[PDB]
Amino acid sequence: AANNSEKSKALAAALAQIEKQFGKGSVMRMEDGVIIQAVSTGSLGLDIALGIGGLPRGRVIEIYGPESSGKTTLTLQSIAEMQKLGGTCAFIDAEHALDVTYAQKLGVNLNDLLISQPDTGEQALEICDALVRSGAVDLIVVDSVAALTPKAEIERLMSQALRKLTGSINRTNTTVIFINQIGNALKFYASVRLDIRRTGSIKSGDEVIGSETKVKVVKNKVAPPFREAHFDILYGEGTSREGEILDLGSEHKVVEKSGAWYSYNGERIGQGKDNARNYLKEHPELAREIENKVRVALGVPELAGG
Amino acid sequence: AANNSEKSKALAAALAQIEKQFGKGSVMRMEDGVIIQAVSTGSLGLDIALGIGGLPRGRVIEIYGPESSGKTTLTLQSIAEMQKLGGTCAFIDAEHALDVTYAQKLGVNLNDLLISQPDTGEQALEICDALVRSGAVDLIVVDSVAALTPKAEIERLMSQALRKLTGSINRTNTTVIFINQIGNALKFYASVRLDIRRTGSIKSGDEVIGSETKVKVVKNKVAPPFREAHFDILYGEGTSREGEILDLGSEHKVVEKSGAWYSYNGERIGQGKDNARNYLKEHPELAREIENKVRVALGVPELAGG
Amino acid sequence: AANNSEKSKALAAALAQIEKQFGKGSVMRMEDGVIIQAVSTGSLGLDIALGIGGLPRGRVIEIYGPESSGKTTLTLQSIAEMQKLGGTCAFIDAEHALDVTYAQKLGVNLNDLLISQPDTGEQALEICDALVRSGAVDLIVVDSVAALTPKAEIERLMSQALRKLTGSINRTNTTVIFINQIGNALKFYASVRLDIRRTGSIKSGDEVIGSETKVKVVKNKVAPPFREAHFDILYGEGTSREGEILDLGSEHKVVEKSGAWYSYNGERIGQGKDNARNYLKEHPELAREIENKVRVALGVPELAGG
Amino acid sequence: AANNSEKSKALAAALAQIEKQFGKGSVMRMEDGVIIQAVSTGSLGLDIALGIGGLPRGRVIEIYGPESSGKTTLTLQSIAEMQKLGGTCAFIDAEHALDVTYAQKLGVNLNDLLISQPDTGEQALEICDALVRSGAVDLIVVDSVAALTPKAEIERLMSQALRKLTGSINRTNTTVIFINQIGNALKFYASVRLDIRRTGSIKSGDEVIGSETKVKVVKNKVAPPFREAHFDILYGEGTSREGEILDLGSEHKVVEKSGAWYSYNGERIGQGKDNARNYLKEHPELAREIENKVRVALGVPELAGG
Amino acid sequence: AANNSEKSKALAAALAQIEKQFGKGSVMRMEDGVIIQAVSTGSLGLDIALGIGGLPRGRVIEIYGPESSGKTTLTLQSIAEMQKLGGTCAFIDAEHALDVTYAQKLGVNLNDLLISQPDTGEQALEICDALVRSGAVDLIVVDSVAALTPKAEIERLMSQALRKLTGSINRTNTTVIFINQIGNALKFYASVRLDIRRTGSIKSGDEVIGSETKVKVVKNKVAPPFREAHFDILYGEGTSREGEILDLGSEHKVVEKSGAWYSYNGERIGQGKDNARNYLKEHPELAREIENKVRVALGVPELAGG
Amino acid sequence: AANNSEKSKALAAALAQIEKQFGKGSVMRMEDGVIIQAVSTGSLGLDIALGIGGLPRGRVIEIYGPESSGKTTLTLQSIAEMQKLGGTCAFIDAEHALDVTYAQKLGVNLNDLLISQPDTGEQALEICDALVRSGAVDLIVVDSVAALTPKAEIERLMSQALRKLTGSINRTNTTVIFINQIGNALKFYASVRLDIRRTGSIKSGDEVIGSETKVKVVKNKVAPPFREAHFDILYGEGTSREGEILDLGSEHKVVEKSGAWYSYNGERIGQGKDNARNYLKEHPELAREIENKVRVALGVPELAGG
Numbered sequence A, B, C, D, E, F: 001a002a003n004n005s006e007k008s009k010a011l012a013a014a015l016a017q018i019e020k021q022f023g024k025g026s027v028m029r030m031e032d033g034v035i036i037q038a039v040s041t042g043s044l045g046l047d048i049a050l051g052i053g054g055l056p057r058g059r060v061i062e063i064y065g066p067e068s069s070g071k072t073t074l075t076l077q078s079i080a081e082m083q084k085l086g087g088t089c090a091f092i093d094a095e096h097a098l099d100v101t102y103a104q105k106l107g108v109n110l111n112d113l114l115i116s117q118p119d120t121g122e123q124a125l126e127i128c129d130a131l132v133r134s135g136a137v138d139l140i141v142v143d144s145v146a147a148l149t150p151k152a153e154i155e156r157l158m159s160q161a162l163r164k165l166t167g168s169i170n171r172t173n174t175t176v177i178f179i180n181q182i183g184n185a186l187k188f189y190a191s192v193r194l195d196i197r198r199t200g201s202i203k204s205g206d207e208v209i210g211s212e213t214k215v216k217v218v219k220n221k222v223a224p225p226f227r228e229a230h231f232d233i234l235y236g237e238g239t240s241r242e243g244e245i246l247d248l249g250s251e252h253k254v255v256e257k258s259g260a261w262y263s264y265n266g267e268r269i270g271q272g273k274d275n276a277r278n279y280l281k282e283h284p285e286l287a288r289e290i291e292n293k294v295r296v297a298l299g300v301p302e303l304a305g306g
């Protein structure tokens, strides 16, 4: 009774003192929402699972998973989203696999993309630090952890580098994403860790044209962890974000399914999911409007409209 | 003399204080007119009997009467009228008898009609409350009182629900109509109670094509009670409102009967009542113009023209 | 000399003060013309004798004379003229003698004619007052004075009624004509009093087809009194107005008689009076043009052309 | 030398000042031409002698001469010419000799001719004044001066009348011609005075069919005086104007005499004068064309062609 | 350790005392930058090699080198730059080779250029002194050392003159440049000595249109000596300064080479070096903006923008 | 050595004592400048030759020379200059030759000019004395010496008069100029004596439009004597002062000759001397600005600008 009031008073005061003393995000409740500066992953479901609506800026991010699970796709979409915000992006490459026609399809502006193919793991982290320290680079993607071979071996690395790097990152608000194939110092320094995997084939006839994808946020220091997103990745197209908008939009009653049609605000979008997705692809301002309504319904920060 | 002046002064001051203290409509004179936000019943005669020109918005309405007397017809017309105003409508159904071809003939837009077929009487009133609380539903029809069986029985309900519901209704201006076949808590919470019954057959040859209908306003908190309306309900067509317009229009000298013809503003409408009704059906803007003149002559608020 | 100037100055100033104090028309000179809103009697000669070109609107008119002298004819023509102006007319009948084929021949539109056959003299004047008070009736004919029997007798009337009626008439600009067969309160309230009588037969062979008619304006408050008009009334046709136009037109040099022909503006109208009258009947716009020239020559207001 | 220049400068300036001060026509040179609104006399030779091509409008004209010299003929032709211009004419007759078959032969439209046969000389001049004052009469012929007997005698007249009449004539542009048989006040008020006389017989066999006629302009205030015209007047036909056109036309080289033929513009008109005159009578538009060329050659204003 | 701190303390204090006692620039470190009032040489590379961004004002300058190496070009550009600053310039000529079409192409305003062709070496230095002493001449070019023949010979000079001249120069802030063909007193008095030579031909086909040029700063009292600049001199155009801006701009990452294009601030300048140079020639405010960014990157004072 | 120092010390002390004892101007060096209250002669060259920039105020001036050499011109210009200073002027005339259109062209305000034509030489000097003694006349011109005939002769004069007059002149600061045609007492009392003569014709075609003029200051007590001025006097225009400004201005480097143009402060004045003179005439404030710079360069006091 007064026991319960006394107990809730004490919990609140402790939670507040913990946040003051150890920093925001140090203790959360598992289903907490958010009251934030983020860059979209290009997946609405993943932006929602992240709680703040995207990857947090000025932080270290790790994305790991088996090859062809969607890691590079997610980072190229993040680059395209950051470029849309007006930000400058760099790709530090130790894998030599980038396909720039694909990057372009995902919205990356290659004219403005910085690229580095470093001579060693040391050199990769030092170049990464130099770009962070410039104060003029907004997002860096490092591909990939394992490939970051020490000079001695070519003829604790991660750990001292990450110490130096995180120092720089905190001063300049640069976002840095490491792609890791499936390293340990990363586990503590990262504010967000994503576990991505293929969960099924998508097929046209017996031609596979894509993959069902699951991403789990296994570490999240800016909103509660362990949320998941499920979306399609289509060959040549990346995340089917328009599909997410229709699915989540209909689920949360923003978008109507009227017989065979998807409709929004009393107007038809398309007959069947493929037609409706294509219409949203052709009408990106409408797509963004609907997306933002879905974000608001779920308590997730909006993206830029306009 | 001065006795009479003193007496009239005292009556007026008491009536004014009663209205201030107990609310408008608490004491009226039986033939009072009105100085109001209403939705039409689809019957001109009933809108006139209601005094304010329709059902009052933000209030509870009860419509009761024997089966096939016209209750569902009146509520579907009210839905069509509310949709014409731009309002969102819901039908909460415990009778499983709705005919949507008929609803469409009466002008209901099924695309925009919310529908619920609840699992119990409790569930019906809770869903009704949730829709009222949304602030986004303008009119709810609940069919029907008796059918609202308590969960325990399936395996005071009305009374506590109506307490909660009327609280919500007053905050959001939602209109809620209960259809009752021939419950007690309704008698006090309802601002308007309608008693509807069939009073005769309408025939083509020996084929009955409709029914003469009488509606009595047995409770009216927004204008004086106990007025009545008489109109035809035709199978497949609902209230013969064009017939009411010609009848009341001619009665109150707005519409002329010139020999065999009905005429308005010096122009023929049709030869005989059937032809004139059909012409008004084909010329709804004229029908509304004449209807509104009749309303004005009787001291009843107008509907939207245009 | 200066005596004459002083005397004319004094007369003028008195006449002006009398008009200001007692109202226009209170003192006139017997051959005064006019500087007016009127409705034609259907007789050009009578419209001229009235000075203002017709009966004055917003006033009481009395027309009296022996039966079959032309009273009803004059009032039906006045109705037809008022309807031509767009005005609404009523006939209050205590004589039960109206012939509506004749009324139609005289140009009355029966569709728009209000009719009343009152239960008593009181009822006649009360209905007359109600029509005046509507503000929507332009001309009322009351037939006839003597027939207006008091209720008590059926089982001062005129006088108190005329007091009330003239009050209403002055507010609404309604014209009211009383037909009187040959009452006293009428003598003062009437602005115009007409004395009409038959003065001779008109014959085809030994078949009488009409009557020579004399109307004397015995009271005139809107222009000088005691002028007279002489015209034919033909069975089935009313006043021979085309005959008046030719006669007065030729008299005042507007219309030419060239040998056997009547001519206007250098063009033949017809050979002999009957042919010329028929031509004007067939060419009413020409008839009106010539009529208006005659009115202008005599200092009488014009009618509508077009 | 400079004497001559100084003298011509002074003369011109005086002539200009005289015209400004005393009016146009006050001083002229005897052979002056003209730079005018006129009505033809029906004689080309006389229209030329008048300088302005006809009698001046808005002026008083006197025509005097022995009986049968051609006075009435000239005035009837002037009437016919004025009617051709669209003007309204009046004949004020104290002689009782008019032959209207002759007037018609000369082109007078009797339908439009006003006629007066006054009771006295006074009455004649007063009617003349009233017609002038109308502003609607273009030409008045008064026949004849001597016959204008004073009332007293029947049981200075001309002089006070002419004062009043000339006042009216100047305001309204009416032309007034007085025929005088062979009065003194006329000598000064008239702008033009014509002296007409027979100078010889015209014969067919020993049948006289006409008369050689001489007209002298003894007073002319609109162009120089004392010019003369000589022409034939034929019984029943008036002035032989076609003969004048051929004579003056050939004299001034407009018309050719080719052997026995008269020709104009390279085309034969007729063999011998009689045939050529008749052809011009039958072809009045050609006659007018040739007449106007002759007028132009002589510096005389043209008539209407068409 | 503390040995090193003690040693660095002592060096700094000595360097500071040397500067105070012998003057700024007396001891420098070879790669020192600068913390200055300068006039541009018209070569960005040479302005950079000079450290302060141009020739120092209020000082003596020597420029020496073989004929046609670019000496006169550099001094005419310095004149044009000084005139751009609003300064008054003089050219003292003992060589008689000036081409003023070329001077104009290089931006010299001939209207404001003072010119002297002295009678002897003595007279040249005395006129130079008089111009310096005026306090109204900002830059003097003396062409050329060897040609400055003593009067006695025409029928130590430099040394006593330079003593007097440097006294005047220090009081008035006049800049004086001596052109020397390849004198000894100059070696000590000069604050800056430039060694310029042709190092190669520039060709269009087999037509030589210019020369590769090297300038070495062999003496520099205002910033460290022995730096070098390499640039093109084109016949008729002088130093290719726009070429320097593109080269140094791209080298120091201010200007982008994107495929075949040079670009700055995200906007194309031109396809290939010639087109980009011409664009900068046509857009001098942009050229200056880019030049100044390059200066800032290298630690060199800026020029006036605007 | 010390001989030279002793000698220069002695000279200076003697010169200083001579000035104290005999008055300023008693001993000068021939090329001395000046350290003064003056009125301009209207000639810049003459104002410069006078050393103090004009005639000295409060002194006697003699101007002598052959007729038409420019004496009257110089005195009328002096009057115009004195009036410009706000001073009151008088002209005492024994020659009767003054042309006041010319005086006006030279800038004399005739409204304010006092004039006297005395009866004798005695009377002239007595009136001159009375005007001086008023304390209210600033400049008096006496024309002319020879014409100043003694009364006895009409039926030593100069000498006793000049004694009295110079006494008055010294008290009141009046300037008095005597014009003398080519008297002895004048030679000593005058502070300034001018010898003016024509030295050549100025011609347009073979029309002489003016005269080259030389003025020598043969006596000067306020600055060194014997300086000369040469200027044009143009018929109707007086001294060509704008021409002097351009000539002396260009000579002393204030005004530029740039090709065919005269220019000042970088702005064109006119193409050729005539155009430049006219521009300065139209822009008197500029003319004065340039004139004053020339005066300052020569060590001569300035005139009022503004």
Ligand SMILES: Nc1ncnc2c1ncn2[C@@H]1O[C@H](COP(=O)(O)OP(=O)(O)OP(=O)(O)O)[C@@H](O)[C@H]1O
Binding pocket: A065, A066, A067, A068, A069, A070, A071, A072, A073, A074, A095, A097, A099, A102, A181, A209, A210, A211, A233, A234, A235, A236, A237
């Ligand atoms: N160049 C490309 N063109 C078209 N689609 C591509 C391309 N690369 C990848 N994809 C799509 O994205 C899916 C995952 O590829 P992605 O490179 O994003 O994963 P990854 O984990 O970075 O791969 P890896 O480990 O092989 O370097 C692929 O299965 C394919 O459907």
Ligand SMILES: Nc1ncnc2c1ncn2[C@@H]1O[C@H](COP(=O)(O)OP(=O)(O)OP(=O)(O)O)[C@@H](O)[C@H]1O
Binding pocket: B065, B066, B067, B068, B069, B070, B071, B072, B073, B074, B095, B097, B099, B102, B181, B209, B210, B211, B233, B234, B235, B236, B237
């Ligand atoms: N589906 C329909 N099609 C055509 N006409 C109908 C239909 N339903 C009702 N009507 C007309 O309206 C009349 C009354 O029906 P309505 O359903 O409005 O009354 P109710 O009181 O709600 O009925 P119940 O009590 O049977 O559910 C009927 O007699 C019929 O004439």
Ligand SMILES: Nc1ncnc2c1ncn2[C@@H]1O[C@H](COP(=O)(O)OP(=O)(O)OP(=O)(O)O)[C@@H](O)[C@H]1O
Binding pocket: C065, C066, C067, C068, C069, C070, C071, C072, C073, C074, C095, C097, C099, C102, C181, C209, C210, C211, C233, C234, C235, C236, C237
């Ligand atoms: N029904 C009719 N048809 C044709 N002509 C008619 C008719 N009624 C009247 N007239 C003509 O008009 C004349 C006068 O009739 P009117 O009714 O105008 O006079 P009244 O004074 O109103 O008559 P009463 O006193 O008989 O009611 C008649 O003599 C007749 O020539």
Ligand SMILES: Nc1ncnc2c1ncn2[C@@H]1O[C@H](COP(=O)(O)OP(=O)(O)OP(=O)(O)O)[C@@H](O)[C@H]1O
Binding pocket: D065, D066, D067, D068, D069, D070, D071, D072, D073, D074, D095, D097, D099, D102, D181, D209, D210, D211, D233, D234, D235, D236, D237
């Ligand atoms: N009625 C006529 N019919 C034919 N020709 C006529 C007629 N009247 C006149 N003429 C011709 O005109 C000539 C002159 O007649 P006119 O009447 O013009 O002269 P007048 O001076 O007015 O005559 P009077 O003085 O006789 O009244 C006659 O000689 C005749 O040739």
Ligand SMILES: Nc1ncnc2c1ncn2[C@@H]1O[C@H](COP(=O)(O)OP(=O)(O)OP(=O)(O)O)[C@@H](O)[C@H]1O
Binding pocket: E065, E066, E067, E068, E069, E070, E071, E072, E073, E074, E095, E097, E099, E102, E181, E209, E210, E211, E233, E234, E235, E236, E237
């Ligand atoms: N009059 C000119 N027109 C065009 N280009 C010129 C001209 N003079 C010089 N140049 C260009 O500049 C280069 C060097 O000439 P400049 O006179 O600047 O050198 P310099 O050392 O002063 O010459 P010199 O020693 O011959 O007097 C030439 O090779 C030529 O390309």
Ligand SMILES: Nc1ncnc2c1ncn2[C@@H]1O[C@H](COP(=O)(O)OP(=O)(O)OP(=O)(O)O)[C@@H](O)[C@H]1O
Binding pocket: F065, F066, F067, F068, F069, F070, F071, F072, F073, F074, F095, F097, F099, F102, F181, F209, F210, F211, F233, F234, F235, F236, F237
């Ligand atoms: N009235 C005038 N109009 C125009 N120019 C004149 C006039 N008077 C003099 N000048 C110009 O000035 C010149 C000298 O005249 P000015 O009268 O100044 O000399 P002066 O020595 O006083 O003459 P004088 O001895 O004849 O009285 C003349 O040659 C003429 O060019």
Ligand SMILES: [Ca+2]
Binding pocket: A266, B111, B112
């Ligand atoms: Ca809808």
Ligand SMILES: [Ca+2]
Binding pocket: B266, C111, C112
């Ligand atoms: Ca009607």
Ligand SMILES: [Ca+2]
Binding pocket: C266, D111, D112
């Ligand atoms: Ca006619």
Ligand SMILES: [Ca+2]
Binding pocket: A111, A112, E266
């Ligand atoms: Ca770019």
Ligand SMILES: [Ca+2]
Binding pocket: F111, F112
């Ligand atoms: Ca004054």
Ligand SMILES: [Ca+2]
Binding pocket: E111, E112, F266
């Ligand atoms: Ca210049």
